[PDB]
Design a protein that fits this description.
The complex is a heterohexamer, with three copies of chain A (172 residues) and three copies of chain B (162 residues). Chain A has helices at residues 4-14, 21-32, 34-46, 48-62, 76-99, 103-110, 113-120, 124-143, 154-171. Chain A is mostly helical. In chain A, α4 crosses α5 (76-99) and α5 (76-99) packs antiparallel against α6. Chain A is flat. The two termini of chain A are 24 Å apart. With 162 residues, chain B is mainly alpha-helical. Chain B has helices at residues 4-14, 21-46, 48-62, 65-68, 78-101, 105-112, 115-121, 126-139, 144-160. Classes of the chains: A mainly alpha (172), B mainly alpha (162). Chains A and C meet through α4 and α5 of A and α6 and α7 of C. The complex binds phycocyanobilin (CYC) (9 copies). One phycocyanobilin sits between chains C (59, 66, 72-75, 80, 83-84, 87-88, 90, 110-111, 118, 122, 124, 128-129, 132) and A (57, 60, 67, 74-76, 79). One phycocyanobilin (CYC) binds at residues 33, 35-36, 38-40, 42, 142-143, 145, 148-151, 153, 156 of chain F. The PDB classes it as photosynthesis. The entry lists the keywords light harvesting property, photosynthesis. It forms a hexameric assembly. The entry is titled "Crystal structure of Phycocyanin from Synechococcus sp. R42DM".
């Protein structure tokens, strides 16, 4: 896996070059925005349970066939597995925000998830929808102006969104 | 590879846990450190030719046998001098990568893993690289946190070479 | 899932053995039990509306805050009451499957695995279900071996909710 | 694995239904015939070594090329493997009788077997003949009127036959 | 299968090592032995009919019940005598393979693996094979290193059958 | 795996036959030439490090892009792995000479190597060139008349070459 820094390092080593000023300056800005990145991680983490619980409930509300007997989320074992995958994806999204690179999420979580789901008959379109709900909740929690020094978190919010989008597309 | 950010996530991942205050503190220490890391990388980069050819010259002067003894492993031909300056160039560039990463990761991955094997097979004396590194340390002219971090990687490599 | 018949075969299979008198004794014990187990499953099924409605009403009475407190986890709306009666029906239906099977296997597979996690995530109180199960135990009208086998499944769930 | 009872349970749960009265009555009739099932398992078990050895002996008499040098059953290791296979299939057939469901035999014995035989060049048609001979020996043993309470075992004998025929087809 | 050459390489391979003087000495050992091994294989092949028939007959004299008792496992019929002669031939041939290989490997692979299972399932008395091997030992007429190596294989089988 | 002796044994057993006099005599000739086999193994082994190092050096001198940044032998980890592969291939080649049969080399070394390389992006054609360089070096060492009792090693040298050729062809 890479973090934002080792990612750029790998690109430069492959060409046998020192980082360029553009590369160094880009990492400088990331550094300068670091408190926001940390607040983004903390805020999602602090609300993890309710992000999962509430998106799950809304998912089952809109898709009652998932919880009907014979549904994919019917029985407590399958409901537990389903709640667990929700939390796993949210967890790995927070890792990507923390390192500033998608690789932890792609390499350790999303890669081969579609195939996993196909074999079990987990409906990936419903997973994707659950993820999208978590995304919307997570974004509103991070953007919330209360109890925090005020400023512009649009870059970190956009990066965050992008990781949720990867998660939903990896199973959709 | 090893940096504060990848290590924190690997720890949390291996416990199946969300990041917590512990890893947030890691991120804080990373971001406290990074500007001087980037500046150290930038300075070494800008001063690469002087440092590499200076270090080369300090090795040849410390070990005159290296420029006057025939051999594939020696710097007695233009080819061998070029191999040696190349190598010193690699050490320096990969040090800059460690400063960029804020960890030994780039060193471990691109230089340190296999180093002993390489030095042995090609009959390259660890003491030659130790000397080149001592020169870089004595001559990069860095101050403060830049110095401290850059010297930690340099000494990391000297330690690895002895 | 766990029934006398699957357990006996799995034991034999893991030892690489043909079935022997030990497992035939398990079968005899199974077939001695099954007549009353099947009869109990038939009675509970025919009585399900009465049991499920009575169990829900027992719970609402024992815990009146469940019908008056607003909340996704509560039975203060028609939808909430419907969720609750639904869940109680699940417990009853799956108890009948254990009688059918002659073991906890259907309970373990369909209801008990992930149970704590569900009750935690959705903020459902174990004690609600204990009360529902108590009502079922008191009102199923079974006797003899039917009663004893049924009561063991109901008690097995009460134990798992405590 | 399912037994006869849990097989019916699985179906009912997926529909979120109690077993119907007729479904329960069918299981009641299997229960009332339980002694015959037990005698069937015990009888085959009691004669397992000779059921295997006699089937094998006849197979090799009819198919001399199996045991000629270079043949699939030639060398003590290959002969031992072949006998073992016959015993394993008989064993799993008895488990299926004991449980009143094919799943133990399908999941633990028959699944993958065709493919394994194709990889090794075991002649599947020959294994299938071997299984059919064991079926015939076992049926005659189970149907014997000597030294048992008299009654009608045609249903359990037919069920027993069906597991052998399933096994034979899985490799033929 | 087990021979000096395969055993030496498996050792070296397991250690991740080049062969060294140790394994060369193994090969020196193999090549000192092999001429007498190959001579023994030739001699036993040339004399196979006599040794087999003679061995069969020695079993029939020591254990006359084997030719007078009806049963699938006995040699009271022409078919039975023929299975018996065939088996003894298998023993003899596979011994010649051990002499060719300079090791028990062929015995191990083609005869010994599964031997107890076959003797047991088909009700063949190990003492029958013992007697036949004793006869071959007493009558092959071999001398020196040929006799010693061949007897090692025959005794190896006698030990395996007892 | 087989040695030269068990290879002939395997062919005979499948046909239910004693080795012919012709087959026994062919093995006799192999045995009579054993000292040259032993010298071949010892000669390569005594020179293993320089055979690998010189071949590697020559490979990189003719294909500099292998060691340039971004090249498959760039970084010390990749270099050490490449050097190890060369050493492994040479090692297994000597085991084939020792046993007098290709199977040790094919079964334990070359089988699946093409696939391994393709999955890693190791350039198999460049490995093959490395192998051909070791072949020529090794052949010249084994061939060298100095310091050994004089005689004709043409057969064993040709057999040696055949093992190197198998290696080169397996990696491409
Ligand atoms: C977008 C995410 C929202 C936002 C963020 C934001 N944060 C800061 C500044 C800081 N936040 C912290 C964080 C912590 N201190 C701790 O001890 C811990 C626990 C381990 C945390 C999570 C810190 C130290 C700072 C600096 C001090 C300060 O409050 O300024 C800013 C200010 C700019 C900056 O990057 O520093 C901003 C904008 N603010 C919003 O309005 C968004 C909704
Ligand atoms: C078809 C398979 C043959 C057949 C079977 C048959 N069996 C019974 C009855 C019983 N069999 C047993 C068996 C055992 N008792 C033990 O203790 C053991 C050892 C562990 C065994 C294996 C028992 C207990 C009974 C019941 C009492 C009795 O003796 O009858 C029947 C009778 C009907 C019934 O199901 O009970 C039958 C028909 N009968 C045949 O003729 C078939 C060839
Ligand atoms: C082709 C490979 C070259 C060649 C080989 C060659 N060798 C011999 C004979 C011997 N070689 C040995 C070797 C060893 N003795 C030891 O103790 C050790 C260390 C463990 C080794 C490696 C031995 C014992 C002999 C026999 C005695 C002797 O020196 O002759 C020959 C001679 C014929 C034969 O096969 O014996 C040959 C030809 N010689 C060449 O000219 C090739 C370039
Ligand atoms: C009745 C005793 C009390 C009550 C009930 C209540 N339950 C839920 C939600 C769920 N119930 C379950 C339980 C099961 N589902 C299964 O698959 C099985 C085994 C087959 C069981 C026992 C689950 C998983 C849920 C959540 C998912 C779903 O809605 O199906 C609710 C609604 C919860 C929500 O937050 O939406 C309620 C109200 N609540 C009371 O106050 C009663 C006393
Ligand atoms: C809930 C939104 C949906 C749903 C989910 C569901 N998933 C499974 C099973 C698995 N999910 C995973 C995924 C992961 N496990 C990991 O360790 C990682 C990476 C770290 C991921 C991303 C796996 C591996 C499985 C299979 C094995 C297991 O159960 O753990 C189930 C269970 C399916 C079953 O029948 O067994 C379910 C139900 N189901 C829905 O209906 C929702 C749309
Ligand atoms: C200079 C201090 C002395 C010197 C140098 C010298 N080096 C080589 C050859 C190699 N050096 C390396 C080193 C690296 N390759 C990597 O990928 C990395 C990390 C990115 C490093 C540090 C390697 C692998 C080689 C061998 C292969 C190659 O040619 O690239 C030589 C040539 C040796 C030869 O046998 O060809 C020389 C001369 N020699 C001196 O005398 C100087 C004092
Ligand atoms: C005898 C009637 C026939 C025959 C059989 C034969 N089979 C094999 C090898 C295998 N058979 C199995 C089967 C199973 N293993 C299990 O554990 C299970 C489920 C519990 C089954 C059903 C397997 C796995 C193998 C391969 C592994 C092994 O050898 O143990 C052989 C050996 C083939 C070889 O070349 O080694 C043989 C000979 N062969 C005949 O000719 C008869 C028709
Ligand atoms: C002769 C000493 C006595 C004797 C022999 C006898 N053997 C069999 C049957 C078998 N013998 C073998 C043995 C082998 N098969 C192999 O692959 C190998 C290694 C290459 C050996 C040693 C086997 C496997 C069988 C059974 C299968 C077959 O028929 O080939 C019989 C027939 C027994 C039967 O039940 O059909 C007999 C008669 N019996 C005596 O009384 C002699 C003293
Ligand atoms: C050098 C001439 C070329 C080269 C080689 C190279 N190989 C690898 C990695 C592997 N090589 C093997 C091969 C084997 N492993 C074994 O144990 C055996 C049999 C005993 C063999 C033959 C394997 C398995 C690997 C992968 C695992 C490992 O690293 O050990 C690499 C590393 C590639 C990477 O990116 O990790 C390299 C570089 N590369 C060149 O450019 C030369 C043409």
């Amino acid at each position: 896996t890479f973090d934002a820094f080792t990612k750029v390092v790998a690109q430069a080593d492959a060409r046998g070059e020192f980082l360029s000023d553009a590369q160094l300056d880009a990492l400088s800005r990331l550094v300068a925005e670091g408190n926001k990145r940390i607040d983004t991680v903390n805020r999602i983490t602090g609300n993890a349970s309710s992000i999962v619980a509430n998106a799950a409930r809304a998912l089952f509300a809109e898709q009652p066939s998932l919880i009907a007997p014979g549904g994919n989320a019917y029985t407590n074992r399958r409901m537990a597995a389903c709640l667990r995958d929700m939390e796993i994806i949210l967890r790995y999204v927070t890792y990507a925000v923390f390192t500033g690179d998608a690789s932890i999420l792609d390499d350790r979580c999303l890669n081969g998830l579609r195939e996993t789901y196909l074999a079990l008959g987990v409906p990936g379109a419903s997973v994707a929808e659950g993820v999208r709900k978590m995304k919307d909740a997570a974004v509103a929690i991070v953007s919330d102006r209360n109890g925090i020094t005020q400023g512009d978190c649009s870059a970190i919010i956009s990066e965050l969104g992008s990781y949720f989008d990867k998660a939903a597309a990896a199973v959709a | 590879s090893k940096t504060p950010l990848t290590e924190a996530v690997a720890a949390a991942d291996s416990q199946g846990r969300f990041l917590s205050s512990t890893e947030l503190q890691v991120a804080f220490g990373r971001f406290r450190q990074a500007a001087s890391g980037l500046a150290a990388a930038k300075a070494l980069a800008n001063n690469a030719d002087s440092l590499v050819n200076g270090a080369a010259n300090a090795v040849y002067s410390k070990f005159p046998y290296t420029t006057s003894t025939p051999g594939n492993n020696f710097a007695s031909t233009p080819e061998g001098k070029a191999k040696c300056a190349r190598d010193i160039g690699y050490y320096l560039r990969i040090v800059t990568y460690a400063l960029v990463a804020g960890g030994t990761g780039p060193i471990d991955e691109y230089l340190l893993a296999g180093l002993d094997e390489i030095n042995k097979t090609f009959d390259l004396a660890p003491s030659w690289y130790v000397e080149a590194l001592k020169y870089i340390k004595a001559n990069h002219g860095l101050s403060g946190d830049s110095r401290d971090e850059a010297n930690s990687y340099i000494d990391y490599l000297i330690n690895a070479l002895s």
